Amino acid sequence: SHRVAFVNNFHMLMYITTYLGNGELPEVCINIYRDLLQHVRALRQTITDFTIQGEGHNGETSEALNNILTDDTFIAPILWDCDALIYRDEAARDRLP
């Protein structure tokens, strides 16, 4: 079945893709990962060209003020770790975590 499973396991896929570049494995997954990386890079470039660097007293708040979606309040539907939550809790220090 040409359909590909293990799509929701991006957390392990992003680490598997590092070793996936051996050569014996099919290159369709490598091409998909390369396309996803290119799309991510293009999105980052567009979001950093649209934004304007300046202001901010607590840190790099320009991205949060421009994109809005860059804020760390929105978390994944399935919890996997809390280190990022603790980091943003002690970094914001103004949203009463």
Partner: protein, 97 residues
């Protein structure tokens, strides 16, 4: 990523050239804090020792053009070839002739 070799063991990538940008290398080097890494990626684009961009302000406009265009390398190379000239009076007359 590479689990076979520990991060920051064989190489110590550091920002030494204003044109050469290695944002993920600092993160992969390990030992820094998230806030410091994100701020260093966001605000300062030049290392402190090479921050004197007035020495050669040539790579910045072409880099900006190539990042905004994102494609069409033919016209980029044509523009670079057209702009690759000198300022001496003899060079101007040679170009005109």
């Amino acid at each position: 990523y590479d689990e076979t070799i520990a991060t920051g063991t064989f190489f110590y990538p550091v920002p030494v050239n204003p044109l050469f940008a290695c944002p993920e290398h600092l993160a992969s080097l390990r030992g820094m804090t998230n806030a410091r890494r994100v701020l260093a990626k966001m605000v300062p684009p030049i290392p402190p020792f090479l921050g004197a961009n007035h020495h050669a302000t040539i790579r910045q406009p072409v880099a900006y053009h190539v990042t905004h265009s994102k494609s069409d390398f033919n016209t980029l190379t044509y523009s670079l070839l057209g702009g690759y000239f000198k300022f001496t009076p003899i060079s101007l007359t040679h170009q005109l002739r």
